[PDB]
Amino acid sequence: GISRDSRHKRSATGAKRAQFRKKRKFELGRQPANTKIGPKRIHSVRTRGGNQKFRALRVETGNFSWGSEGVSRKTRIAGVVYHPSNNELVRTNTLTKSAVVQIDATPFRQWYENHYGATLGKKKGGAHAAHAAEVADAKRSRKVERKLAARSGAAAIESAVDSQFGSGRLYAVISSRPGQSGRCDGYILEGEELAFYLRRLTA
Amino acid sequence: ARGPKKHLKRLAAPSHWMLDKLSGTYAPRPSAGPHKLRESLPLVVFLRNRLKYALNGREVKAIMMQQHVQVDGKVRTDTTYPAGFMDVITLEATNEHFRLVYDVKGKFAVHRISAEEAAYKLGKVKKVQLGKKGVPYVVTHDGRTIRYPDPLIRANDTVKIDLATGKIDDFIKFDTGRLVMVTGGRNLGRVGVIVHREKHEGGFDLVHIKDALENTFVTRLSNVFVIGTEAGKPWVSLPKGKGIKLSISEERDRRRAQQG
């Protein structure tokens, strides 16, 4: 089948190489998984040495992380909004490494209010104000505010991520390789890495 | 090509086994084990070609099936078990304790040792690295893994194995003046003391050694095994010659004087 040997290629000089031997098993290749978003469907693959690769054909959720304040949460993935290599990967929403996606911000937003006590998005609509008030008015012990008091001040995060929470969806980049590991993990965009990705998405 | 070879032609065998050309087509292929195939000795070779206890390859197999042969205090049932350097072979039926150490001529000399001396061994430290859960360990020349060594132990050093509990009794630090037995090259089998270790970063370091007769040779660090902390105090009973390499003329004169 697909082979990665350099024999069928021509040399650096441009010379065609005469047929040396038949194709070899220890240098084969395989068919791309072409992971989509959908009901989770994973096929395990027998590889060299008896080891196993996990082909993810469809996935819905992945382990996404805040590197800035050290929380990793499993959350749904909506779809790909940008892929650096080929842009039709976005069109058909195919998940590979280094793809930029949108994920629901709620499992992250849940931890923010429990950990810091404030609310993200900062939207000035009526429903958001109701959400904002209920969090800061929640029942706690006496020392719980003092514990939350120490964490106050560092809870103010950069504007671009905070603005995202109003839509309930966060930008992310897939860190894993879905066709190799069987997972679709990632981390949340931040800093100049995020702002560089926003420049073209808004175009 | 489709897998590892399981055969060994007679001419393809290591030269130091002294296997005769016209005995047959094939030679004993050492199994996987503590020592590399080219630098080791199948037990079938030792009990038939050196000790001459077995007259052929069939008789040795019955020997080991009666549990007499012990390598480093443990029974082996594989005729082609790769015994190697400083390995202890005990045949208690004969009341004989062996240690495989090179003669000066580069080959495995038949060296009989005392019963007590058969209860330890020396191993060259290959690497010191931290294992799982923060447990550093040491790999010796025969692949032994000793956990929790002395934190002073580093690479190129020689440790003493109790050969029973698998622990460390003592070790010899690698330094200038250390007694050394060479285990490779054409300087193989020579015994001497380090003079100067020349470091070649990114390559192979060489160990300068002076022999017992003020003979100087230079060899790669990969062949250097420490056997004693200073000159003339080896931790093991050195075989005939004490790693002293002579001229061919001296050997002839000694031969002329010895038998006539």
Binding site: - | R10, L22, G24, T25, S247, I248, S249, R252
Partner: protein
Amino acid sequence: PRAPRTYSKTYSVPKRPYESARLDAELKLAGEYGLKNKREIYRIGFQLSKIRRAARDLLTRDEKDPKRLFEGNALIRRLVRIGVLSEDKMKLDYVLALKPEDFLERRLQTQVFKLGLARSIHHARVLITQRHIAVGKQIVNIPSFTVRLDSQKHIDFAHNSPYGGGRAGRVKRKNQGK
């Protein structure tokens, strides 16, 4: 399969085929030694030429060279052992001073003649191939058996040979028993 068993020739035919100067000389040398053919001369010629060739290399070396020494004396000791080199001629120069006649003088066929056990040199070869002469306690029937100096004195008739205290041969038994 099995490792090859090496073999090598022991003689070499001369380049020029018909030269009466060489043709008569080879007849002369073999005729008085009772040699069977010229191969026994081509064998002595080839075997002696390589002895010179070994010595020729060492003389090109600088003296006290341990290869020139160890190899030089080792070659010389072998030659004096069989008597082709005189005991006072241990200089590696007399080895070049050797001739075919020297080692043919060392043959079993030659020496049994000079020890008088057979009337003629051709009768000397006959005593050999007909299994009558024993060197030491081992019967040798090789005409070309080179005799060492220590083996020089131990050449005599075989004890089971009819000429050496053994029983009578086929002819005598048939006739004396007729």
